[PDB]
């Protein structure tokens, strides 16, 4: 269900965001993968206007340097 | 290092693979990621033909059936 959720287009990140892990909570992943997730997916799995952010944002980042940086 | 592996375009995919991996030795991933690695990226992270395959081959896939498809 997770890799096919890409981001939707007009969709502010939080929401891409809000749906990713309540996915996630669905495939009950560990906290580990949650965070290893992150880290990749939630990236590469972004609308390519924040996800040119995301990935110069860089990986370390916690979650809200990347929802600050995507508003 | 592993959202930045990407597969590699005159790369057999065997290889790509075989990098993957000896990457996710490094950052020492449970099997537990290992096998959610598998399921995500390790095909998003690939070229544009074996990206397609393995998109169409669906999870659930064992590597197996992944590189058998991927020749």
Chains 1, 2 share one sequence.
Do not use: H
């Amino acid at each position: 269900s997770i890799l096919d959720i890409r981001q939707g287009p007009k969709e502010p990140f939080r929401d891409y965001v809000d749906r990713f892990y309540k996915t996630l909570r669905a495939e009950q992943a560990s906290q580990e993968v949650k965070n290893w997730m992150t880290e990749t997916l939630l990236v590469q799995n972004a609308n390519p206007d924040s996800k040119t952010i995301l990935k110069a944002l860089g990986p370390g980042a916690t979650l809200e340097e990347m929802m600050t940086a995507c508003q």
